[PDB]
Amino acid sequence: SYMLPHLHNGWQVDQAILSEEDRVVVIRFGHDWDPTCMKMDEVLYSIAEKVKNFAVIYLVDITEVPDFNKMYELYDPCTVMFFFRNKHIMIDLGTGNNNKINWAMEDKQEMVDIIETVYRGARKGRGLVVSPKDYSTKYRY
C-alpha cells in the first residue's frame, strides 16, 4: 500500500525539499519491499497525522532515484534523513555518524521525539542537534 507520497526522480525530490519553509522534511531512502523499510514505513505512516503540524514525510526508492546515493552515501537497506529550508540537519544519536538513521527503530514515541527535537533545533538555527537518548547500545536487558 504505502499511501504516503513517493518521489520518482531527483527533480521531484528537490522540489519537495524546497517546497516546505516551516516544516521539517523527512525522507525515507530505501526499497519498499525490504522488510526494514516496511517496518520504518509502518511507523512513519502511524506518526504522519500526529506530526502533520511541523513535519512532512516522503519516500524514495533507491533504484528509482539513484542519483543521491554517492553524495548522501545511501548504501544501507533503509535510511532516514531530515532537511529544513534546503539545509541538511545532523543528529548526535551516538551511533557514530550524525548524518542519517540507517536502521529501523520500532518506537513511534521516540521517532516523535526525534522529529520534535530536529524541528526545534532547526528553528533555533542549529545545523546539528542532540537527540534526547543514546542509541550506541541496544538497551536490551
Binding site: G10, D14, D67, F68, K70, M71, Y72, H88, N99
Partner: peptide
C-alpha cells in the same frame, strides 16, 4: 535538472 540544482552538497 539533477539534484545538484538544489544547491545541495553531499556530506
Amino acid at each position: 535538472v539533477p539534484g545538484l540544482g538544489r544547491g545541495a552538497t553531499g556530506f
